């Protein structure tokens, strides 16, 4: 792979938010190197056979909670911006798709960050009960009782 200078979406030293595709839970990370895919020997850096994409470009990141974990390479789909905007209590729906925390060993507790789809918002005077179904790795939890339904964040898309 090649130093990226023309199309990564984020920059060396930025701040990102990068998806551990084996549990599917988003992570603080620092990006330290973009890269893509070398031309071949006998391939022009600007190929008309294959144009260069943003979606191609690897984002090596050090987890900031995790420097034990090295530089990890990370898709282009598994990084993103930062969470910053919290969607009010009120304004959740069903239907929403948002990154809200959740521990899938032991719901009643503190967990990690995923994204999930609101299933199920009920309230009483005593009771608010937000329901989601939840994206991990290599499946999704369907239907999960979601403790911490006041701090559930949107989801950064350019543009959006």
Same mark, same amino acid.
């Given at each position: 792979?090649?130093? =990226? ?8 030293? =930025? ?12 992570? =603080?990370?620092?990006?330290v ?20 994409? =943003? ?5 090596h990141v050090k ?7 090295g530089v990890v ?88």
């Amino acid at each position: 792979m090649w130093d =990226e200078t023309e199309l990564g979406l984020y920059k060396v030293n =930025e701040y990102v938010d990068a998806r551990d595709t084996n549990m599917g839970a988003w992570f =603080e990370a620092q990006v330290v190197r973009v890269t893509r895919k070398a031309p071949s020997r006998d391939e022009p850096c600007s190929s008309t056979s294959r144009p260069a994409l =943003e979606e191609d470009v690897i984002y090596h990141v050090k987890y900031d909670d995790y420097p034990e974990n090295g530089v990890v390479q990370m898709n282009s789909r598994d990084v993103r911006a930062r969470a910053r905007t919290i969607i009010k209590w009120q304004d959740l729906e069903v239907g929403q798709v948002v990154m809200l925390n959740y521990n899938p060993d032991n719901p009643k507790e503190r967990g990690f960050w995923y994204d999930a789809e609101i299933s199920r918002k009920r309230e009483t005077r005593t009771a608010r009960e937000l329901y989601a179904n939840v994206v991990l790795g290599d499946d999704s939890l369907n239907d999960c009782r979601i403790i911490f339904v006041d701090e559930v964040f949107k989801i950064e898309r350019p543009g959006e």
